[PDB]
Design a protein around this ligand. Structure first.
Ligand SMILES: Nc1ncnc2c1ncn2[C@@H]1O[C@H](COP(=O)(O)OP(=O)(O)O)[C@@H](O)[C@H]1O
Ligand SMILES: Nc1ncnc2c1ncn2[C@@H]1O[C@H](COP(=O)(O)OP(=O)(O)O)[C@@H](O)[C@H]1O
Ligand SMILES: Nc1ncnc2c1ncn2[C@@H]1O[C@H](COP(=O)(O)OP(=O)(O)O)[C@@H](O)[C@H]1O
Ligand SMILES: Nc1ncnc2c1ncn2[C@@H]1O[C@H](COP(=O)(O)OP(=O)(O)O)[C@@H](O)[C@H]1O
Ligand SMILES: [Cl-]
Ligand SMILES: [Mg+2]
Ligand SMILES: [Mg+2]
Ligand SMILES: [Mg+2]
Ligand SMILES: [Mg+2]
Lengths: 260, 261, 260, 258
C-alpha cells in the first residue's frame, strides 16, 4: 500500500495517480466494506491506547477538490471512535482577527494535544492552494510558504506529533456528478454555493497548486498519501488501512487494597 | 418519560429518585438495546440536520458521582454521530490560569457554536459541588453562584442554546462495586485515582450538594433530568430518548439557497 | 465625586448631565494638569501594588459617542503606567467566529486576570447600543440583554473584579468639530470612515440607547460614571480621580539569607 | 552602534561583550536621560504611525539572567507609549495544558497582530535555556529546537513581523548586588523566590546556554543584540536607540484617504 505514499524526492506528478484506481484491494465494494469493518474496530482499539497512554499526538490532514470526500471520510473512518479522544478542526474563510496574524497562527492553535487525535478538515495548505489560485497574496509571498510548512511540520513531528496528510483525489467528471447530485438533493443542497462553480472553472489551476504543494511538502516526518477517491468504498478502506498501520507502528501501551 | 425532568418549584428531593428504577421502559436489557439502536440512528439524522441548518447550539451537561457513567454515556449515546458536529469538553482541576479569572471564564470558552452539539463532561456545576463539599471557598461565596449559573444559562438559552442537564444517579453500593471493578481490570486501572476514596468518604455531602444544585438551577430554559443510572442499558436508553425528543422539538429544517459544465 | 455616579434607581436622565460642566474642579486647565500629574503618579504606584499583590482584578469600561475621547483617555490616564500590568481590549465589528457563539463569549475571554488592570475600549455594551440603533437583532432579543449584562457583571464583581464604567459625555456640536478636525488633519484622517456619517445621523437614537443602557445597568457592584467630556483636561482629571480613589480603597498590600 | 548586533556567522562569543561597557554613548547618566527622553518621544510618534498604518507587526524579545533588567526595560523604554498599541506577554512555568502541546503553541498564541507592538518578557528561548540547563527534556530533543526557532522566526518575518531580540547582559557580581537589594527592599521582596538562588548557582551553565542560543538563532531577519546592562541608563538608552532606528527604517506611512 506504500505506492500511495509520496516520496520526498521532489519528483511527484499527479498524472501518475488515477482517481478511479482500486488496485490495492483485491475485490469490490462488498468485500471492501467487510475489510473496513475489521479496520474500524482496530482503529477504535488503537484510539483507546493513544488516549490512555497520553503521550502521542496524532494529526490527520484532509485536503481535496470541492466534493472530494472530506466529510464522508471523517464520518465513515472515525465511526464509533470515542468522541472524547477525537476532534475535528475545520478551516474556512479567514476572519479579520485571523488575517491580522500570520497564516499559521489560527492553525497552530488547533494542533492535537497529548493522547488526542485531531482531523484538519482543510488546513494550513489552503494558504498555498486557494491563496495561490486566486492570488490572495503575490507569488513572492506564497512561494516562501512551502518551507514554512515543512519546518512547522518538522517542529510538530520532533515534539511528538504523528502527521498523516491525505489528498483525496477525484476526477473532473466525478466532481461534476457529485456537484450535480448536490443540486438535485434537498438534504444536500445546503453544501452547494454558487462559488463552487468558479472554483470548478479553476480546476486545472487547483490541480497544479496541489501537485506543487504535495511535491514541496511530502517529507519522511510528514508524508502525503494520494488517495484515489472516485470510489468511496476504496477511499474509506485505504485511509483506514494507512491510519491503522501508522498507529500500530507507534507500539502504544496502557499505563501501569479493598474499597469499603 | 419526562417525570425525570426536575420542575422549577424549588421542592426537588433526591430521595424521590431510585437509582434502580427502570419504570419508563416496559421490558429489560435486550428490548431496550433494540430501542436504543433506533434512537441512536434518529440522533445521527437529527445531528446532520442541526449542523446543516447551522442556527441552533446544543449543550448537554453530564454530572454524576465518581464512576456514575459519564464516559459510558458519551461513548454509547453519541456512537456513530459525526465527529465534525459533536465535541466533548472535560472540566478537571482548575489550572493557575483558570483560577486567575472567574470560575465561569474557562466554561464560557467551551460553549457550543451554531450547528454544534457540545457535551460537558463535568461543568460549571463543580463550582457548587466539589467547592462546596471540600469548602474550597466560604459559603458566602459559593451560595451566590446558584444565581450566577441561572443567569448565565438564561443568557445562553436566550441567545440560541438548547440546554439539557443530566444527573446520572447511581447508589452508594453501585459506586463501591464500580470502583472495585475498575481497580481490578488492567485495561481500566489507569482511570483509578487515590482521590476517589476521599470523595467516597464524603458521599453524603456530595448528595446534599447535588440536591441543592439541582433544586436551585433546574429552570424552564435549562432543565435538570435525574437519570436512574445503576443499569447502563436504562441510563443509555433514557438519555438518548430525552435528547432525541428535545432535538425533534426544535423542528429543524434543511437550508434552501442550473446544470454543471 | 459621587455627583457623577449613576444611582441604581432606574431614574437616570442624560439631560441632567452637561458635557460642558467642570464644577468638581475649582480651577481651569493649568491647575487641573498639575492635579492630574499628582494622580497619575499615584496611579503608577497603585498599579505596581495591584500587580505585586496579584489578588484583585480591575475592569475599566470606556463607552462614548464617536470622537468622545476613548483613545485620549487611555493615552493620558494610563500615561507611564507599566505596560506589564495594563491591557487594552478593543471591541470592533464581530467576526463570523464571534457571532457563532453568544455576544458575551468574545467579551468574557478578555476579562482581567488577578493582578491585572484591563480597559475595554468599547465592550459588551455595543450589544445594546449599535445592535439596538441599527436593529442587528430584533427588540425581543436585545431587550433581554440588560438583565444578561447586570447578571454577568454581578458574577464578575462577586468573583473579585472591581468594575468601573465610564460614559464619556460630549455634546452634538463638540462631536461635529472633533469629526471635522479628524477630516482636516492628515495624521487623523485614517480614524474617519464613511460609516461615521451614518453614526452621526443617528445621534439621537444613540443618546436614547445610552440613557436606557446606563439606566438599566448602573448598579452598586458595577456603577456607571457620566464624565462631562467636552473639556479633555476635565475628562482626564475626573477619570483619574475616580480610578485612583477606587484603587486606594482596595487597601492593597505587598506580599511578604546572604547571596554568594 | 552596530557593534551590538550579533552577525549570523556562528562565531558569537559572550566573553567579547562587557556588561560594564558604555562606549556607544559619549557621556554619563544625566546626558543619557535627556537623550533617552528625545528617543522616547520619537518612539511614541513611531508607535502612533505603526498602529495607524496597521500593516506591520513588531516583536521585541527580552531575555536576561535573573535581575538582568527585563521589567525595568519595559517600564522605561515604553514609558508614555499608547497602551492601545503595546502589549506585554510574560512566559513563566509551563502549565499541564501548555506542556500537552509543542513548546511553540503557547508562544505562537501571543505573537503581535497588525499595527501592534508586543514585548515577550521571556519567550520561546526559555525552551533552550532553563529546559537545557535543568535537562527538562533530553539533549536529543532541545538540540533540534534551534532550527525550529530560526524557521518559526523566518515564517513570522516573511509574513510581516519585525523581530528584535535583546539579551540584557549583566555580570555575576552585578546580579549578586541586585538580588541582595531585592531581599532588603520591602516593595521588591515579592520578586524574590528561593529558586532564584539555584539559578544563581547555575550562572555558568546559563551563560553557556545563552551563548549557544544567540550563536544558533541570530539571523538577518531576526537579529540578537547584546546589551551591556550593568548600567540601567545605558541599557535603556541603547534599547530605545536600536528600537527607534529599526522602526524608522520601516518608513511607515499614514493610510491613504478613502
Ligand atoms: N487560508 C484560506 N484562505 C482563503 N480561503 C480559505 C482559506 N482556508 C479555507 N478557505 C476557504 O474556506 C471555504 C470553506 O468552505 P466550506 O463550504 O465552509 O467547507 P467545505 O467545502 O470544506 O465543506 C473554502 O472555499 C476554502 O477555499
Ligand atoms: N471547579 C473545580 N474545582 C475543583 N476541582 C474540580 C473542578 N472541576 C472539576 N474538578 C475536579 O477535577 C477532577 C476531574 O477528574 P478526572 O479523573 O480527570 O475526570 P472524571 O473523573 O470526570 O473522568 C474531579 O476530581 C473533579 O472534582
Ligand atoms: N457588538 C457589536 N456589534 C456591531 N458592531 C460593533 C459591535 N462592537 C463594536 N462594533 C463596532 O465596531 C466599530 C469599531 O470602530 P473602530 O473605528 O475600529 O474603533 P473606535 O471608533 O472605537 O476607535 C464601531 O463602529 C462599533 O460600533
Ligand atoms: N519553557 C519554560 N520551561 C520551564 N520554565 C520556564 C519556561 N519559561 C519560563 N520558565 C520559568 O518561569 C519562571 C518565570 O519567573 P517569574 O518570577 O514569574 O518572572 P521573571 O523572573 O521573568 O520576572 C522562570 O524561573 C523561568 O525560568
Ligand atoms: Cl461507494
Ligand atoms: Mg464548499
Ligand atoms: Mg470609529
Ligand atoms: Mg475570529
Ligand atoms: Mg522573579
Amino acid at each position: 500500500m506504500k505506492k500511495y505514499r509520496v516520496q520526498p524526492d521532489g519528483r511527484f506528478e499527479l498524472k501518475r495517480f488515477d482517481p478511479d484506481d482500486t488496485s490495492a484491494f483485491e475485490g469490490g465494494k462488498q468485500a471492501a466494506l467487510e475489510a473496513l469493518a475489521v479496520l474500524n474496530r482496530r482503529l477504535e482499539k488503537l484510539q483507546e491506547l493513544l488516549y490512555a497512554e497520553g503521550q502521542h499526538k496524532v494529526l490527520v490532514v484532509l485536503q481535496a477538490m470541492d466534493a472530494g470526500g472530506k466529510d464522508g471520510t471523517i464520518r465513515v473512518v472515525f465511526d464509533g471512535v470515542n468522541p472524547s479522544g477525537v476532534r475535528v478542526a475545520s478551516f474556512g474563510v479567514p476572519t479579520e482577527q485571523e488575517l491580522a496574524r500570520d497564516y499559521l497562527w489560527r492553525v497552530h492553535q488547533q494542533v492535537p494535544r497529548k493522547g488526542e487525535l485531531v482531523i484538519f478538515n482543510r488546513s494550513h495548505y489552503e494558504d498555498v492552494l486557494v491563496v495561490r489560485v486566486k492570488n490572495l497574496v503575490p507569488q513572492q509571498v506564497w512561494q516562501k510558504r512551502y518551507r514554512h510548512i515543512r519546518e512547522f511540520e518538522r517542529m510538530l513531528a520532533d515534539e511528538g506529533t504523528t502527521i498523516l496528510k491525505f489528498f483525496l483525489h477525484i476526477s473532473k467528471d466525478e466532481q461534476r456528478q457529485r456537484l450535480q447530485e448536490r443540486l438535485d438533493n434537498p438534504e444536500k443542497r445546503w453544501k452547494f454555493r454558487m462559488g463552487d462553480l468558479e472554483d470548478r472553472r479553476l480546476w486545472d489551476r487547483y490541480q497544479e497548486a496541489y501537485e506543487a504543494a504535495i511535491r514541496e511538502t511530502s517529507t519522511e516526518y510528514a508524508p502525503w498519501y494520494v488517495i484515489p477517491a472516485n470510489k468511496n468504498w476504496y477511499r474509506n478502506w485505504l485511509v483506514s488501512h494507512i491510519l491503522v498501520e501508522t498507529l500500530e507502528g507507534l507500539a502504544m501501551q496502557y499505563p501501569q487494597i479493598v474499597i469499603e
